[PDB]
Amino acid sequence: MNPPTFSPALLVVTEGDNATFTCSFSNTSESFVLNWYRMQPDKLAAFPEDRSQPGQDSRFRVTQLPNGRDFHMSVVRARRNDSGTYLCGAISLAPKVQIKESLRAELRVTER
């Protein structure tokens, strides 16, 4: 498995705006999960949507775009406190279980 890429490296938005990173990942034929983390990593959202646990309400979304390779990692109503660094991590579920991380990207949320 190849690592995913995560862009843009720096995203600056105003508080109250949405913010969207793009994770790009070229899969093999094997099952995978793509996690979005805020960086100890904190998992914000995943693709596919997790069906092993009950649904959760969230400002964070991961969506696979129709080209399959790109994924939007979005925050709604960004707050000053959302400023920080983030990454996406691909987990191969076969033939070997492994995680490969993108480089980090920074979100800067500026005052209104």
Q: How far is the CB of 83 from Cl ion (least distance, A)?
A: 19
Site for Cl ion in 66-105 (CB under 5 A): 102-103
Query: Which of residues 52 and 81 has its CB atom nearest to Cl ion in the complex?
Result: 52
Q: Evaluate whether 98 touches 1 at the Cβ level (below 8 Å).
A: yes
CB 72 within 8 A of CB 22: yes
Q: For residue 44, is it left (φ>0), alpha (ψ between -120 and 50) or beta?
A: alpha
* Kind and range of the H or E run holding 101: strand 98-101
Order of strands across the sheet that contains 60-64: 5-7, 19-24, 70-75, 60-64
Options 16-24, 48-56, 65-73, 77-85: segment touching Cl ion (CB under 5 A) = 48-56
Which residue in the set 6, 21, 37, 86 belongs to the binding site for Cl ion (CB under 5 A)? 6
Q: Does residue number 49 form part of the binding site for Cl ion (CB under 5 A)? A: yes
Among 5, 20, 24, 92, binds Cl ion (CB under 5 A): 5
22 in contact with Cl ion (CB under 5 A): no
Residues of this chain that bind Cl ion (CB under 5 A): 5-6, 48-49, 102-103
